Amino acid sequence: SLALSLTADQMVSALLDAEPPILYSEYDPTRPFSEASMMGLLTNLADRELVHMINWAKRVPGFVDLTLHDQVHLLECAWLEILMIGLVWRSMEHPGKLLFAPNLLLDRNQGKCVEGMVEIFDMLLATSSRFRMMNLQGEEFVCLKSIILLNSGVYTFSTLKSLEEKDHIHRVLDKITDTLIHLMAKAGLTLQQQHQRLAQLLLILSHIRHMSNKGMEHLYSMKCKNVVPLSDLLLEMLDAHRLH
Amino acid sequence: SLALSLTADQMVSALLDAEPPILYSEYDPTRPFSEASMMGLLTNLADRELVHMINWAKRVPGFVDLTLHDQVHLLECAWLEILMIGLVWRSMEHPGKLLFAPNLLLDRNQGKCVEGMVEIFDMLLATSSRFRMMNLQGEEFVCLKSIILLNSGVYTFLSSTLKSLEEKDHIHRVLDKITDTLIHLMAKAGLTLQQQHQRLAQLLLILSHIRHMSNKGMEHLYSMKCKNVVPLSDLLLEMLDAHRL
Amino acid sequence: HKILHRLLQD
Amino acid sequence: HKILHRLLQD
Ligand SMILES: C[C@]12CC[C@H](c3ccc(O)c(F)c3F)C[C@H]1CC[C@@H]2O
Ligand SMILES: C[C@]12CC[C@H](c3ccc(O)c(F)c3F)C[C@H]1CC[C@@H]2O
């Protein structure tokens, strides 16, 4: 089936090479921030990141084996999670700050410009602090990000073809588990430290799920208040969660 | 704290001994459901279940070591996740059904008695199927549930200042112990080292979906609150106001 | 002063 | 139809 036949180090390389680039913001220091304008920047950025994500996802081993229907569902379910773990990752070296872009580095007090957004910034900054405390490695990050892609929507899939696709996904997920463990072993962690750290990293995905759900609702309310014009792509991702 | 000195077997025993009882629904005697009727029963059950959860939480090793404020925060954040994972657990042996109580076993289609609730049932049922497909063990269940209690709200521990840092480190230490306990159970079950790690990953990733169901459930319950389809208890309203304001 | 507070001590 | 569906082909 390919993907399954990959070694750990092969798995790592594939994920590392598939990594999307860091994009810039259309941030214009000419004008002061407004709620509408900050929401404009952030969502414009998200939109352009999405296109790269979609293409990144296809380079995640096992993902293109799935139906178009299943690829869509997985991405629809996990897109904001995937954006957030990437953000939290590149924000690691910047305590008290979120590096949305190299030209867009925001602290929590700048998040207060948008109503109810500082709560989301606070959670994001805490996660970044958590990753920094754990000394999260790049190889570990790309494993976690692929795990989010394959797992977050797998439970929301009758039929037997639907079970064949579910099984295949879990096969690949188990492969990344093997990859993560192998990484920690190579890094010289004890056998005990291996399963302890594996647990720590995966439990963070529960908070990332939480941040996404709070983020989805916040973005949705901004939409329903006509604060920001969203791309048709974003409207469709947002729509996939119903929300209210 | 004599929580970090527990053996893996003593951890299991403590959690099993701490287990809350399976409450009954007042569903009487069997009148045809309505929207207000089912919401009434479900929320009534939830309120009664919550009181027991709080005493169960106090018996989770390491939990009572935390400040009053932090204990409150952990329960406020995790209460619906804890109910849901319990619901899913006792619904394992009843495929396509949700056992809210021994006398309240709901089919999927009965979730359509309440607007928008069937989608939440669907997610709970899918989780139940995964547990069943994994052949989830009781000792594993109590480990996962305790993990949810300690893990869900520890990141939102605002004030990363002073003796709140000591708190967070304590919680992570206990979490490691429970992790060790899960692995111990799998090792005892005869799983290979690779099988152990894979199953651990599989169980914890389910907690990501349990978080999702809780966030959606909170939103639904809030919408039902505002529409006044059902009068909620003071306790429920408080737990609900923790995710809002 | 919340109900949760009371039950945690009780 | 859906943009995401279209993008997953291009
Ligand atoms: C505008 C938001 C904040 C920034 C959010 C956002 C944008 C781009 C990212 O790369 C990212 F990681 C991220 F999280 C996207 C939305 C979610 C909640 C708010 O409405
Ligand atoms: C009434 C609800 C459905 C059942 C929910 C619920 C009740 C009791 C449980 O033991 C449980 F596990 C559970 F999930 C509680 C709320 C959440 C969304 C709906 O409004």
Side-chain angles (χ1 to χ4, degrees), chain A residues 3-30 32-159 163 165-241 243, chain B residues 1 3-27 29-30 32-157 164 167-226 228-243, chain C residues 2-10, chain D residues 2-10:
Chain A
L4 281 62
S5 308
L6 300 178
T7 75
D9 285 321
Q10 282 178 329
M11 174 66 70
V12 179
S13 298
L15 295 184
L16 288 181
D17 295 319
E19 270 297 271
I22 300 182
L23 302 176
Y24 278 77
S25 170
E26 41 165 45
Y27 169 55
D28 179 30
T30 279
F33 274 115
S34 71
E35 167 174 271
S37 66
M38 184 171 303
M39 282 297 306
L41 278 186
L42 295 178
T43 55
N44 165 271
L45 176 59
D47 175 72
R48 279 182 297 119
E49 287 184 282
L50 274 178
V51 185
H52 288 273
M53 182 195 303
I54 291 165
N55 289 277
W56 155 83
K58 292 157 74 167
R59 293 182 62 175
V60 171
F63 184 85
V64 296
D65 295 325
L66 307 170
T67 69
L68 229 44
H69 176 94
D70 289 342
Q71 295 177 38
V72 162
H73 177 65
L74 284 184
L75 278 168
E76 281 180 341
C77 180
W79 68 272
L80 186 48
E81 282 188 79
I82 297 171
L83 288 176
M84 281 177 171
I85 189 177
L87 171 66
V88 162
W89 167 251
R90 54 185 188 267
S91 299
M92 275 187 56
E93 308 166 83
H94 307 79
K97 292 171 178 63
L98 296 177
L99 194 138
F100 283 94
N103 61 340
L104 192 55
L105 187 77
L106 308 187
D107 54 45
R108 75 178 302 276
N109 279 344
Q110 289 172 296
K112 305 172 68 166
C113 180
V114 174
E115 181 188 43
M117 192 175 71
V118 71
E119 277 75 25
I120 298 180
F121 275 25
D122 282 340
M123 296 188 292
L124 289 166
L125 286 160
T127 311
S128 188
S129 171
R130 174 60 179 167
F131 278 179
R132 183 170 57 251
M133 163 166 51
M134 295 192 63
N135 190 11
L136 182 71
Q137 300 295 304
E139 299 83 351
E140 287 171 332
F141 162 72
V142 299
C143 285
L144 294 181
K145 186 165 62 167
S146 287
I147 284 175
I148 291 172
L149 176 62
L150 297 174
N151 177 75
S152 287
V154 79
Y155 309 103
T156 36
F157 275 12
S158 55
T159 331
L163 295 189
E165 296 275 291
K166 272 207 205 68
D167 179 75
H168 167 58
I169 287 181
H170 286 130
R171 295 291 274 273
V172 181
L173 279 176
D174 290 339
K175 244 299 171 181
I176 304 177
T177 301
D178 300 344
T179 296
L180 276 176
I181 294 293
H182 169 259
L183 287 169
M184 303 175 184
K186 178 194 284 189
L189 297 194
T190 70
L191 185 57
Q192 184 181 28
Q193 286 171 335
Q194 288 170 33
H195 70 242
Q196 284 175 350
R197 183 172 177 88
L198 178 70
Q200 290 162 4
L201 292 177
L202 295 175
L203 285 177
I204 297 176
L205 301 194
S206 171
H207 191 248
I208 291 183
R209 177 81 81 141
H210 182 78
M211 290 188 302
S212 169
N213 291 139
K214 288 316 185 74
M216 210 73 72
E217 288 287 352
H218 177 278
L219 178 56
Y220 186 72
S221 68
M222 290 292 104
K223 182 207 95 161
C224 295
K225 289 161 56 175
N226 286 42
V227 173
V228 54
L230 303 182
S231 70
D232 296 335
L233 179 62
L234 270 177
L235 288 182
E236 285 180 338
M237 309 293 291
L238 209 46
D239 164 90
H241 290 259
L243 301 160
Chain B
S1 171
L4 291 43
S5 69
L6 288 183
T7 74
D9 287 316
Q10 288 165 357
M11 181 68 65
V12 177
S13 301
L15 302 181
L16 292 183
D17 291 334
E19 271 297 287
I22 303 186
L23 300 189
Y24 272 89
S25 178
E26 66 267 33
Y27 184 25
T30 293
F33 290 115
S34 78
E35 175 163 340
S37 174
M38 186 167 296
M39 285 300 301
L41 297 174
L42 292 180
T43 54
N44 180 287
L45 181 65
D47 174 82
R48 277 184 291 120
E49 280 188 291
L50 262 171
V51 180
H52 282 106
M53 178 192 305
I54 293 161
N55 296 267
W56 156 84
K58 292 191 287 184
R59 285 161 62 81
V60 173
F63 184 81
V64 77
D65 295 321
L66 304 171
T67 75
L68 176 64
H69 169 275
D70 286 332
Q71 292 178 36
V72 165
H73 181 79
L74 288 185
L75 281 170
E76 280 181 0
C77 185
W79 71 272
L80 185 52
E81 287 186 86
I82 295 175
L83 288 179
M84 281 180 174
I85 194 182
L87 173 61
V88 168
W89 163 247
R90 58 185 190 263
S91 300
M92 270 190 59
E93 294 166 313
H94 308 77
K97 291 177 292 177
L98 291 173
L99 196 141
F100 289 90
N103 56 343
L104 191 54
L105 185 66
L106 302 185
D107 279 276
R108 186 208 91 99
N109 286 332
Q110 285 173 277
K112 297 146 87 162
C113 292
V114 177
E115 172 65 39
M117 195 178 63
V118 60
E119 287 81 9
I120 294 186
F121 272 25
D122 276 334
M123 289 183 305
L124 288 167
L125 289 166
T127 306
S128 195
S129 296
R130 178 62 178 166
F131 278 6
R132 179 168 53 254
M133 178 167 54
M134 289 193 64
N135 187 25
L136 180 72
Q137 296 298 303
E139 297 84 358
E140 295 176 320
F141 164 68
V142 295
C143 282
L144 292 177
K145 185 169 67 170
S146 292
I147 284 175
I148 294 180
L149 174 59
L150 298 174
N151 175 75
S152 291
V154 73
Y155 313 100
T156 54
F157 266 25
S164 174
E167 288 286 85
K168 186 177 172 54
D169 188 40
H170 182 72
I171 287 167
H172 287 308
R173 287 195 302 262
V174 181
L175 281 170
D176 286 341
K177 259 288 182 299
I178 312 179
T179 302
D180 298 348
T181 304
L182 270 170
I183 290 293
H184 174 78
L185 293 168
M186 301 174 185
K188 184 191 305 177
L191 289 193
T192 70
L193 197 69
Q194 183 190 12
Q195 287 174 318
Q196 294 168 25
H197 293 155
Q198 287 178 3
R199 184 170 182 91
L200 176 68
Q202 286 162 357
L203 294 179
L204 295 182
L205 281 182
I206 294 176
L207 304 186
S208 170
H209 183 240
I210 292 178
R211 175 84 80 153
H212 182 76
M213 291 189 294
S214 173
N215 288 324
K216 292 300 178 130
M218 212 73 66
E219 220 66 75
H220 181 271
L221 182 54
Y222 190 72
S223 70
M224 292 297 156
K225 187 208 79 171
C226 296
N228 262 318
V229 170
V230 51
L232 307 181
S233 67
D234 291 325
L235 181 54
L236 272 182
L237 296 170
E238 290 194 0
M239 306 302 284
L240 198 54
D241 205 278
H243 288 260
Chain C
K2 292 129 65 175
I3 297 190
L4 189 59
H5 268 258
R6 188 188 91 240
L7 302 193
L8 253 338
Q9 304 192 75
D10 279 25
Chain D
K2 315 304 161 60
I3 301 177
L4 174 59
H5 185 274
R6 161 71 141 162
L7 286 170
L8 280 166
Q9 308 196 38
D10 300 343

